[PDB]
Design a protein around this ligand. Structure first.
Ligand code: HEM
Length: 154
């Protein structure tokens, strides 16, 4: 798929607001994912002992991981579709080392959209949400193709 320039602008405008607090957004998004889809927590041997939201919020390791996730995603979105080299190592680690099905990438996409709508309602109306949803669908479609090339297809 291809996004128009106007669509990328909507995506990068709200992302610039996210980047004012990467750690905070990273925590919010992972916690949302784990709350909504507790089965995803089982993939993380470093976090699956965490029992409550309070414990998640207090976890420094969880916060650090949130920053890593959003820094990587930000680097991909800023390529505006030209992301083939960025996606190769991400695909390999999520396919071979961790085995993360595509369904779980949909779950985190939902979590990102929820947190952006909650923190940035003025910059995340219907048109901006649509554009962010297209950008994340593009990401998932390209990662799924790489999964298949790698032998997983998740
Ligand atoms: C927007 C989607 C995602 C991005 C940008 C992302 C990015 C990353 C990055 C950059 C790392 C660290 C280095 C590496 O191993 O590649 C990582 C590790 C990992 N990711 Fe993801 N990830 C995404 C989604 C997910 C999902 C949906 C799950 C599981 C439900 C997941 C599970 C893991 C695990 C288990 C690790 C290793 C954690 C550890 O070091 O103990 N990832 N991810």
């Amino acid at each position: 798929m291809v996004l128009s320039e106007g669509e990328w602008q909507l995506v990068l405008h709200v992302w610039a607001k996210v980047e004012a607090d990467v750690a905070g957004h990273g925590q919010d998004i992972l916690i949302r994912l784990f709350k909504s889809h507790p089965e995803t927590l089982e993939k993380f041997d470093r976090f699956k002992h965490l029992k409550t939201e309070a414990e998640m919020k207090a976890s420094e390791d969880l916060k650090k991981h949130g920053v890593t996730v959003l820094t990587a995603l930000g680097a991909i979105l800023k390529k505006k579709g030209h992301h083939e080299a960025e996606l190769k190592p991400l695909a390999q680690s999520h396919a071979t080392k961790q085995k993360i099905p595509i369904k779980y990438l949909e779950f985190i996409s939902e979590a990102i959209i929820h947190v952006l709508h909650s923190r940035h309602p003025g910059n995340f109306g219907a048109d901006a949400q649509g554009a962010m949803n297209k950008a994340l669908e593009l990401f998932r479609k390209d990662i799924a193709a790489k999964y298949k090339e790698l032998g997983y297809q998740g």
